[PDB]
Amino acid sequence: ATNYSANQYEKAFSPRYLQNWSLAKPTKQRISSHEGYTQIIANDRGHLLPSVPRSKASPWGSFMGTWDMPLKVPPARVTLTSRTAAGAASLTKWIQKNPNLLKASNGLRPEILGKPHD
Amino acid sequence: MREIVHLQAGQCGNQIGAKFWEVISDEHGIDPTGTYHGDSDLQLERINVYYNEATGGKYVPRAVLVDLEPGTMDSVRSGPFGQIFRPDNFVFGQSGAGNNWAKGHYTEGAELVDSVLDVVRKEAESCDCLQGFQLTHSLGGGTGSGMGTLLISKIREEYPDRIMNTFSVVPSPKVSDTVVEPYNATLSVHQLVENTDETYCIDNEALYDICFRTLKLTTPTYGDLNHLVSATMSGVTTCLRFPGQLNADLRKLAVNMVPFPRLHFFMPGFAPLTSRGSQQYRALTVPELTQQMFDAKNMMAACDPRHGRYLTVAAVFRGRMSMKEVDEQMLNVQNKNSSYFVEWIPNNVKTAVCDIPPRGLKMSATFIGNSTAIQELFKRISEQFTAMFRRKAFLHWYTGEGMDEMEFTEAESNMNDLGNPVVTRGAC
Amino acid sequence: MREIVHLQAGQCGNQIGAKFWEVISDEHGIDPTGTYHGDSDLQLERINVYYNEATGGKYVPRAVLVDLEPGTMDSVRSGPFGQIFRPDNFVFGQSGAGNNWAKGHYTEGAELVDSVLDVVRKEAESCDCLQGFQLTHSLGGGTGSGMGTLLISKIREEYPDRIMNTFSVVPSPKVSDTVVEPYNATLSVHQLVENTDETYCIDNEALYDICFRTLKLTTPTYGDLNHLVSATMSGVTTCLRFPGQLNADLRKLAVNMVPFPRLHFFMPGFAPLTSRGSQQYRALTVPELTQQMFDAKNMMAACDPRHGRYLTVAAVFRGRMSMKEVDEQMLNVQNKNSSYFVEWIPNNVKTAVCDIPPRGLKMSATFIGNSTAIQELFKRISEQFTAMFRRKAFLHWYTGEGMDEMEFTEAESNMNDLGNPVVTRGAC
Amino acid sequence: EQERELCAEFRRGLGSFNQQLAKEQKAQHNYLNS
Amino acid sequence: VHGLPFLPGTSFKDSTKTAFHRSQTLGYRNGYAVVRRPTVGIGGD
C-alpha cells in the first residue's frame, strides 16, 4: 500500500472526511515519473539478490502495544510558549528520551512548536 | 451506411455494454424484443449504424459479446435487454482468466480468438461502410484486457483503415479491485498505444464523485455508473445517427484531436448531469453546459486537467442551440484559462452541434479531452508496476503461462516512454 | 449590468446575511419558494445584482455561505427563507474553529478555502460585469475573522479591481463575547487595512442603544439587531437597484469617502427610526431625517463622532423627495457644526437620492461616516491587545497552530500606524 | 422517497426475524440442562 | 392575522414554542458532503 492521491477528488478521500479520527497515514502528493526498465531486485522465491544493500528496520512493522509502550507517555501537543527554560528543557528531553514512541505505526507524532522566553 | 461493430469483453465490458444497448435502444425505439415501437421516424433513419434488421421487423444489435466463462453472459441474458442480442453473437469458453492477462492473451485466449474473429467477420463484411468497431473493456483484470487486446490486434491487422474506439475502465487511483491490476494495465496499454485510435479512459473513483457530488445519489449502483459511460459512448456517435448543423463523426473526432500518433488516451465527460432537487436552482443554457463540461470534477478519469495542458478538447453538443452561444463559450473557456491549453496549437477545441437531444433533456454535451495530465494515470500504474516487478511479485502466475520477462520489461518502457511525449508537448 | 457576490462567513456573518436576504427578498418580491409575487415592474429591472436566474422563474441568491462548523447554516436553512439558496453554495467543513484566528487562517480553514473559492469563481464568472464582493463577518472570534480575511486576501489577488465591502461586527467596549477578541480583532484588522476598499464597522452595544433608546424595544433579539445592519446593507446598494436622481453605487461612494487608501473604515447609520410611542408624534420631513441621521444616537459603531472630526460623510436617501431640502439641510449641518468637520475638505458630504423607498415608509436614509472617532475603537483594541500580549496570555493556541510573535507585533504596529493618520486630521 | 420507505421496512422485517430467532436461540442455551 | 411590513421593530416572537431542536441537513457521507433538503424545521414540525 502506498495511499496515492486522487488528484482533483481528494477532499473525499482525506482521512478526517472518511470518518478516520485517529492520526492516519499521509497521502503521497507528487508522483515521480521514471524512464526505462527497472532491474530485478529479488529472485524466484522472493529472496533479495546478494549485492542489494538492504534496510535496517525490522521485517515486521513496529506496532508497539499497550505493554511495550514506555510509561509516562509524552504529550502529543507541545508548544513552548510562555514557558520557562527549565520546563521547556524538561518537556523536550522527555519527548527526546522516548525515541521508540516517535518511530512507530501506533506512534505519537508530536507537534513541537513555539519558542520559550530565552 | 457508416456502421459500428460493438465488441464487448469481460465482466466490465458485457455489463457496461448491456447498459449501452439499453440506453441506445431506448433512443432508437428498439424494444426488449427488438421492434421499433417508437415515434419520430428519425429514430429509424440511421438504425443501420448499430442494428441489423431480421426478417420480421426485429432489429438485432451488431454486438459480439466475448467472455472466458459463461457468467456475466447469463446475467446479460437475464437482464432487461438480454434477448435483443443474437444467441450466436455470444462467443464464450469454459475456464476463466482469474485476473490473469496471460490466461487471456495467450493460454485460454488463443483457443477462443478464431470464434470471436469469425463473428466480427460476418458482422463486418455485411456492411456498406464500417466506420469502425467499439470495445467496452476493463484494462484492470483478465479477459477484457487479455482476450480483448488480442482481438483489437487481430481486427487491426485484417481491417487496418476502420477506426477502433476502446472505452476502458482504467485501474482507479485510491482503491483497487485486482492485485495483479498494475501488471495487467501496464501490459494492456503497451498494446493499445499501438493498436487503437481513440481509447477513452473511464476510472471508477471519478464516476463515483460525479454520482455523489453532482447527481446527488446516496445509494449508487454499478448500473448508474454504466449509464454515465453509456451516455458518453452515445454522444460520440450522434452525428452518425441523427441530423444536425456542423456534423462531426468518429474519424473527424480523431483527425481533429489526436495530435501525434500515440497521444490518443482521452478523458470523457457528460454535461447536463443535475440533481433531482437542484434542477430547480440551475438553468439548462449553453453557458452552464460549458462550465460543467470544463470543470475538473466532472471528468470521468482522476487526472486533474489543471495539473496539465489540453492538447485538443472535443465537444459534441446535442440539441437546438445558437452557434454563437456555443462558438463563443469555447473561445472564452480558452482565452480565460490560457495556462491549461497548449499555445503551439490555435483553437484547441473541435465542435459538433447535432439536433436531437438525449430524450428528456433540452440540450446536452459530451466532452472528449486529450489532456497532458493523463500522464498521472500511466505514471501511477508504472510506479505500482515497478514496486512489483522489482521483487518478482505475483509473476510466477505469468511466467508459468509462458510470458517471458522481456515482454513485461518492454511494456514498462513503452508506457514510461509515452509518459515523456505527454510532458514534452505539455511544456512546449 | 452590475453584480455583487455576497459572502457570509461565520455564525454572525451567516445570521446577518440571512436577515439581509430576508430584507432584500421582501424588497424585490421573492417568496420563500423563490418565485416572484409582486406589484411593480421596477423590481425585476435590476434583480440581476443579487439574484441569478434559474428555470421556471426561480430567483436564487448569489451568496456563498462559509463556516467551519456546519451548525449555524442548519438554523439558517430551517428558517423561513431557507429553501432559496443553492445547496452547492453551502460550503461547510466538519471541524471546529474554536475562535482561533490562527485556526481559521493558517490551518483547517485553509482546507475549505479551495471549495469556497471554487464556488466564488463559479458565481463570479456567471456574470456580465461584476463590480465586487460583500462579505459579512465578525472581527471578534474565529471563522468570520480568520477564514473571512483569508477569502479577502484570496479574492483580492484573484480580482484586484473590484469593490470589497466588509460588514464587520467589531468587539464591544463594555462587555465581550470571546476572550481572545483583542487577538482576533488585531489580526483581522491588520488583514483588513491593506486589502478591502470599504469596511463598515457595526458594534453590538451601539445596536443595543439604538434598539432601547430609539426603537424602545422591550425584548430585542439578534433578529432585530441583524435587521438594522441589513437595512444599512440594503440602503448602500440602492442606486444600482432602483432608479433615481444622483445615483451613487459602491465605487462612487468609495471614491467620495476615502481620501487616502487606509482610511476606509466607516460608521453606518439608518434613520427612519422612531419609537412605538412616537411614530404618531412624528413630523415627517427631510430636515428631521437629517437631524435623526447626524446625531450621535443612531450610530451603529460605539464611537462618538462628537469626540472627533468627520473626514467624509455620505447620505443615501430612498423616496420621492425634493432636492432643495436635501441640499440645504446638508449644507446647513456643515455650516452650523463647523468643528466636527475637516476644513481642508470643503463640503465633505455626498448625496444620493433614489425614488423607491422600502415598502412601508415614504422616506429612508442611510448614513455612512468616515470620522476620526474610529481612533477610539482601534485604540481600545490596542490597549486590550497590549495588556493581553505583554504577559503572553492566551498565546498558547495561537503559537500551537503555527503562528509567531512577529505576527502579533506586526498587527499591533499596523493598527497603531493606522491610528496615527486618523488622529493627524484632528490636529491638521 | 418511496425507495427509502421500502428499504427502511425491510430493515424492520429483519429486525423482527432476528428478534424472534433470539428468543428461539436463547432457548437452546436454556436447554444446556435438559 | 395582522400584516405589517418587514421594517425593523416588527419581528414579534411566538412565546409558546418549547421545542428548539436543529436538524442536521448538512452532514457527511461516504467521503462527501450531502446537502439534504429539510423536511422538518425548528420544533420538529
Added chain:
Amino acid sequence: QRECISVHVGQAGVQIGNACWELYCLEHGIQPDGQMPSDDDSFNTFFSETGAGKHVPRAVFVDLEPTVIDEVRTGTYRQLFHPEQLITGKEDAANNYARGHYTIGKELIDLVLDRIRKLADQCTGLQGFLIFHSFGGGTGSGFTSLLMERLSVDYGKKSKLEFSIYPAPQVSTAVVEPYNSILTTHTTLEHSDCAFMVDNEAIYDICRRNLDIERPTYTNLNRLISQIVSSITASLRFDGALNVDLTEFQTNLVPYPRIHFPLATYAPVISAEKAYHEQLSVAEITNACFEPANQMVKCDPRHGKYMACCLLYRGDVVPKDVNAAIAAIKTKRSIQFVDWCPTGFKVGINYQPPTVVPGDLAKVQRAVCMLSNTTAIAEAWARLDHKFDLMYAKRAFVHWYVGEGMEEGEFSEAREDMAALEKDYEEVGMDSVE
C-alpha cells in the same frame, strides 16, 4: 456532524453517567428502549440510529470492578446501552492509582480504546471526548490517566474535556485520596485540555440551602452535574443566538499551558416553594453564578482573581439583558479579574429551556452555567499538598503503590510538579506594576 463520545470511568462516572444519559434521553425523546416515540436528527450528538428505529447511546462506561455497571445492565435503561459499550472487568483497584495506571488497569485499556474507535468511526464530525471521573480512586485516577495518555497517542490534538469530582475541602471518603489526586493531576496536566472541577461538599450545601433537600445523596448531586453537561453541550443540540462549541471552551478558558482547571457553577437551582417568589431574570441568574456560596467547588472565589469566565445562558434570555448583567458584575469591585484579561466574560445564549427530569429542581424559563478559571483554586492545590506531604513525610501508604508498579520516585516527581503548578498560580496572579 456534532457527535461527542463520552467515556464514563468509575463508580462516580457510571453513576453521573446514569444521571447524564437519563436527561439526554428525556430531552430528545429516546425512550428507555431506544425506539423514539415520534410517530429529528438532533439526537446524533449523543445517539446513533441503527435504522430499525433504535437509538444507541454514544458512550463507553468502563469500571475495573463489576457491581455499578452491572446494575445498569439490569435496570430501566438495560436495552439502551449496547452490551459492548458497558465494559466492566473482574477485580477492583483498591483506591490505588497504581493498580489503575499500571496493573489491573492496563488490561481493560486495549478493549476500551477499541470500543472508543468504533464509536469514532461512525461519527461524521467528532467535537471531542468528555471524560467523567473522580480525582480520588483506582479507576477514577488510574484508568483515566492511562486512557487519556493512550488517547493522545491516537487522537492527537483532539479536544478531551474532563468533568471531575475534585477532592473535598474537609469531608473525603478515603484516607489515600490525597495521593491518587496529586499523581492524577501530574499525568493529565499535559495530556488533558480543560478539566472542569465540581467538589461534592459544595453541591451538598447548594442542595440543603437552595434546593431544600435536608439529606442529599449522590443521586441528587449526580442529577445537578447532568444539567451542567447539558448546558455545555446544549448549543450543539438545540438552536440559539450565540452558539458555543466544545473546541471554544479550551480557547476561551485555559489561559497558559498548565493552568487548565475551570470550576463549575449553575444558576436557577431553586426549589418549587422558593420559586413562587423569584423573577429569575437574566441579571439575578448571573449575579448568582458569581456569589461565593454557589461555586460548586468550595474555594471562596474572593480569595483569588478571575482569569477567564465563559457563561452559558440556556433558555429565554434576551441578548441585551446578558450584556447588561456582565457589565454590572464587572463594575462590582468585589468580583476581581486579572489585568492580562480585559475581556474575561464569554457568553452563549441558546434557546431550549432547561429540561425537567420527573424528580427535582424547578421548571425555570432561564438558567446560566459559569465555567471560570479562578486563581482561587490555588488554595485547593495547597490543601491537597499539605495532605500529600503529611503522609509522604513518613512514606505512609506507599508500600501499596510500590506494590503495583509506581517506583517510589514517581511520588516525588508528582508533588514536585504540583508545587510548580502552585508557583504558576502565583505568577498568573501578580499584576504587572510597570
Added chain:
Amino acid sequence: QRECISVHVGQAGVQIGNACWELYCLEHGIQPDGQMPSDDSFNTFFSETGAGKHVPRAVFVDLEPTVIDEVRTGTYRQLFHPEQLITGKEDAANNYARGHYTIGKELIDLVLDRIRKLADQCTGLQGFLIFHSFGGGTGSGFTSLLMERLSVDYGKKSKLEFSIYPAPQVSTAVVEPYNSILTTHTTLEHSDCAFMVDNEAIYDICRRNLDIERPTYTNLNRLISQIVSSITASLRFDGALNVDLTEFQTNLVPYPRIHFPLATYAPVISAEKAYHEQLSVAEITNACFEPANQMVKCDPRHGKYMACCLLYRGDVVPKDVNAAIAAIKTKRSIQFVDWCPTGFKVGINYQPPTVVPGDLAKVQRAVCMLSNTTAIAEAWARLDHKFDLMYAKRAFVHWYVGEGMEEGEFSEAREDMAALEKDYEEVGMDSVE
C-alpha cells in the same frame, strides 16, 4: 458450466462437510432426500440424475468407519450416492505414515476413481475444494497422497485447501507438531490456496461475538461453512463483481511458497446484539480487520498484509465498499508490504447470507476476507519449535519409521520449514533505494 467438486478428508472434513452441505442444500432448496420441491444454480455443487434427484458433487473419505458410517444413517442418507462416502476399516491412528504409506495406499485408487467419475460429469470444473485437519493422520497423510496424485491428473485445475491449523495453546494431539510439519512439506509444492481456520480462534470469537461460553465442534463447522458458501456465491448466485475460484489464487498467493492465506467473517452477531448494531458496510469491513474477529489467533497488527481479498455478500452498494477499503488504507494500525501497492480484491454479490437454524442472525450484508498476513510467521516458528522439542529426543519417531516415513524425512521436512521462516521474513523486508 461452473461446477466444483469437494474432497472432504478425515473426521474433521467429514464433519465440516455435514454443515457445509446442509447450507448448500438450504441455499438451493435441495431437500435432505435429494429432491428440489417444484433453477439450474445447484449444478455448481449438485448434479441432477434422471430420476429428479440432485446428488452432491463430493467425495467424503475417512480411513476409518464411524464418522462416515454416521452420514449414511443420518438425515442426509438419500442425498449422497452410496459410493461417494468412501470408508476404510482401520484409522491412520494419528500417523502421517499410516495415511501416506500404509492404510491409505489401499484407498487412494478408489477415491481417485470416484473423483474422475464426478469430474467427467462436469463440463467446466472451477476447481477442487479440499478440507483437512493439519493434525490427524488422514487429515495430513491422505490429504498429501490425494493432493500429489490430484496434481498428476487434474494439473492446472485449482486445488483450494480449506484446512484446520494447529492452535496457539489448545490441541487434542501430542503427535500434532510432527504430522503438521510433514504435511506442509508435501502440500507446499502440490497445493494452491490453503485457507487456515484455527479452532481456539473460532472458540473465542463464539464466546465474544455470539455469547456461547461453551461451544461445540458444530457451532464451529457451521461458521466455517458460511466462509465456503461465500467463496462460492458467484459461481452460483448473481453479483456486481464476480470472483471465480481461479481468481482467489492469482490475486492472493504472492510467491509460490507463501500459499497460506488466513480467514475472517463479518456480522458474527447473535440476533440479540444485532438489535443494537447497524451492520453497515463500514462496520462489517473494519471488523474483518479487527484482530479480535480473526479466525486464527494472531494479531495481524504485529505483521504486514500481503494481499487481502474482501468478498461482500448482500446489499453492498459499490460506493460503501470503496469508502471502507479507503478508510482502511488510511489507518496506521494496518500496514502493508512495499512490493504490494494495490492490495485489495473486491467481490460484490447479491445473495444475502442464509440462516441455518443455529446461532448467527439474518443479516442484509456480510463480508469474508482472506488476507495473506506475514504475521503467520509466529505460527510456523511455534509449530517448528515443538517439532524440534521432540524430533531432538527422537520421540514418537519409531511409530512413523515403522509404517514407512524413513526417519530421514523428518529432517528434510524441518529444513524446508526453516525456509518457510526465511521466506516470510525476507518477503517483508525493504530497500533503502
